[PDB]
Structure 1
Amino acid sequence: GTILIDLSPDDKEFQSVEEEMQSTVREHRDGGHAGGIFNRYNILKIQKVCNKKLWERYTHRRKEVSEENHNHANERMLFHGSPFVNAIIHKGFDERHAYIGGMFGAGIYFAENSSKSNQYVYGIGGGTGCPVHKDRSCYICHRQLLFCRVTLGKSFLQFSAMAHSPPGHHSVTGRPSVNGLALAEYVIYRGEQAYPEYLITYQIMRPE
């Protein structure tokens, strides 16, 4: 079902997506432990993920959410890192991708900071790092993230230092209160509320 289309780096669509990736890198409180030490990425490839059944699953669910929230899907584009991106792009999101120990419950987590999603590319807390070098800060191996269309609907606002949504909500917003430089994180509880739109292949870059 899924087919992947290479975007040219001269295409505006590519550039828009790259810019969203580069401009939402921040520093992490773990000093780079989970995700590596870097200020920027080497973007190697960006692919559009095209799957009819998964798209229609998304848009059908989105209409439902919209109708339950003053005609407002509250659709965002957000990052998702995972060692199972190959399974997500082919079969879509489901409970297997839920973060069971998540601070805002057992749901599927997304980030506004590309660097936050980068922390989960090799598993929770970076796992054991890249398969080839067992290095969480590997500058050599290729990483992949997803840049997804996520339907948030009415989103429970949780300030902060597969389950169900809170009643009358379609998602949760984890908004950092302490780190003012940290962007929001969002959780959904149905896989049908995200479409994995772009697969981004990259390396983290070692700082000068």
Structure 2
Amino acid sequence: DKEFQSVEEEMQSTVREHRDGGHAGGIFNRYNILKIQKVCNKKLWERYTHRRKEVSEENHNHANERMLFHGSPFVNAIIHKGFDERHAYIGGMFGAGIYFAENSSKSNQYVYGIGGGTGCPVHKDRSCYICHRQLLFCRVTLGKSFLQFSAMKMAHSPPGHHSVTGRPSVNGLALAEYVIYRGEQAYPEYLITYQIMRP
């Protein structure tokens, strides 16, 4: 209702002009949101709130919770089994983590894989406007977030930290990206079924 409209507003307002020229996610300025489904998985929520509490206690009664986008070819697995760092790619910009973004267009670059992979399954198009894509709008506990400006391949959060904020840099990092090294620090709150729209 008002809950889904703010999700739809956040999905549209956070689109950016990508330094890849739309190569990975596609050519678009806006989406066509088809459905917003609220994921209600109590076992995943219990895991999330438990870790959230531990984190708050190690960061001045502050979880540093953010509402962030996640784009991955594994969204249906995530909605059932939750985020899992055991599946995290080791050679990512910030290492073996679960990457999230404030800009839905960044998460959109990863729905079919790193640099959009091949593209959509049935047409093999990264800029496909026909096939329906899926993004997750997640509750993310960042806790004590470590600000890293360059590439740093780490396996776990830096000592005393609960995440990594990959802040924007000239040579080279276009937009912010939030990385957790523990799956229990994010809850797949909303499942956005959408299509990127041709300008």
Q: CA deviation at 1:177?
A: 2.3
SS of corresponding position for 2:194? strand
Runs of 4+ in 1 over 3 A off after TM superposition: 179-183
Structure 2: state its 5+ residue gaps: none
- The Cα offsets for residues 140-168 of structure 1, whole Å up to 9 and x where unpaired, read as 01000000000000010112488211000
TM-score by length of 2: 0.95
1:178 CA drift (Å): 2.4
Higher mean alpha-carbon deviation, 180-189 vs 65-74, is at 180-189
- Contact 1:99/1:109, CA 8 A, preserved across alignment: no
Are the equivalent residues in 2 in contact too, given 1:152–1:170 (CA < 8 A)?
A: yes
- Asked whether the equivalents of residues 77 and 148 of structure 1 are also in contact (C-alpha less than 8 Å), the reply is yes
> Residues 68 and 163 from structure 1, CA distance in 2 versus in 1: closer, same or farther, beyond 3 angstroms?
same
CA deviations 1:96-139 (Å, max 9, x no partner) are 44132111121111001100000010111101000010000000
Mark the CA change 1:25 to 1:192 in structure 2 (over 3 Å): closer, same or farther: same
SS of residue paired to 2:89 = coil
Q: Distance in 1 between matches of 2:51 and 2:95?
A: 21
Distance in 2, matches of 1:160 and 1:206, equals: 33
**Aligned-residue offset at 1:179:** 8.9
TM-score if structure 1 supplies the norm length?
0.91
Q: Distance in 1 between matches of 2:97 and 2:15?
A: 24
Tell me if structure 1 keeps the 8 A contact 2:150–2:172. no
Q: 2-side partners of 1:76 and 1:169: how far apart?
A: 16
Matches within 5 A, 1:26-37: 26-37=16-27
- % identical aligned pairs: 100
> How far, CA to CA, are the matches of 2:172 and 2:96 in structure 1?
25
Give structure 1 stretches of 5+ with no counterpart.
1-10
Rounded Cα–Cα distance in structure 2 between residues aligned with 1:113 and 1:77: 11
> Please, which of 163, 175, 179 is the counterpart of residue 171 of structure 1?
163
C-alpha distance in 1, partners of 2:2/2:173?
A: 28
Asked whether the 8 Å contact 2:15–2:104 carries over to 1, the reply is: yes
Q: Secondary structure at the match of 2:8?
A: helix
Q: Does 1:122 align with 2:112?
A: yes
In the TM superposition, residue 183 of structure 1 has moved relative to its aligned partner by: 3.8
CA distance in structure 2 between the partners assigned to 1:114 and 1:96 by the alignment? 24
DSSP 3-state at the match of 1:168: coil
Moved more, 60-69 or 171-180: 171-180
Asked whether the equivalents of residues 25 and 105 of structure 2 are also in contact (C-alpha less than 8 Å), the reply is yes
RMSD of the TM alignment (CA)? Answer: 1.7
Q: Please state whether the residue corresponding to 2:167 is helix, strand or coil.
A: strand
Distance in 1, matches of 2:3 and 2:15, equals 19
Structure 1 residues 37 and 109, CA, compared in 2 at 3 Å: closer, same or farther? same
